[PDB]
Ligand binder design. Structure first.
Ligand SMILES: CN[C@@H](C)C(=O)N[C@H](C(=O)N1C[C@@H](Oc2ccccc2)C[C@H]1C(=O)N[C@@H]1CCCc2ccccc21)C(C)(C)C
Ligand SMILES: [Zn+2]
Length: 117
């Protein structure tokens, strides 16, 4: 008999809010990174599964672990994390193990651009 003390129905208790992206996700994550920037919006990076530890740039992955620093002028979080250590909960399940494996093998993204410049 599966008890299931989390995934079953809505309204867990009270404090546990649904999610609220533009309340404790977009502004919250970014607030941890700072006004500073480098490549993409830090929020986007956080959405994938990243969170700053107070200090600028020093950011680590959630659950899966693995710290990331000294980002590249043009790079995505999906490819970065998946390449160094593909073991995130939502990240893996998002595009299945197939996508994660494909990413960690050859170059990805950047397709359909007139004629490869
Ligand atoms: C252009 N891509 C950029 C984002 C990039 O890869 N940057 C690399 C990078 O940040 N790396 C390499 C990994 O080191 C390895 C991890 C796994 C396998 C092999 C090496 C580990 C990681 C790194 O330096 N992580 C540091 C180590 C000290 C503690 C700490 C705490 C919070 C955030 C980051 C870190 C370089 C610049 C340091 C090499
Ligand atoms: Zn991760």
């Amino acid at each position: 008999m599966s008890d299931a003390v989390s995934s079953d129905r809505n309204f867990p208790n009270s404090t546990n809010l649904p999610r609220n992206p533009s309340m404790a996700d977009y502004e919250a994550r970014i607030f941890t990174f700072g006004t500073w920037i480098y490549s993409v919006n830090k929020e986007q990076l956080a959405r994938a599964g990243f969170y700053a530890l107070g200090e600028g740039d020093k950011v680590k992955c959630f659950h899966c672990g693995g710290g990331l620093t000294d980002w590249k002028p043009s790079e995505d979080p999906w490819e970065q994390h998946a390449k160094w250590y593909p073991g995130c909960k939502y990240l893996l399940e998002q595009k299945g193990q197939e996508y994660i494996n494909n990413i960690h093998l050859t170059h990805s993204l950047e397709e359909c651009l007139v004629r490869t410049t």
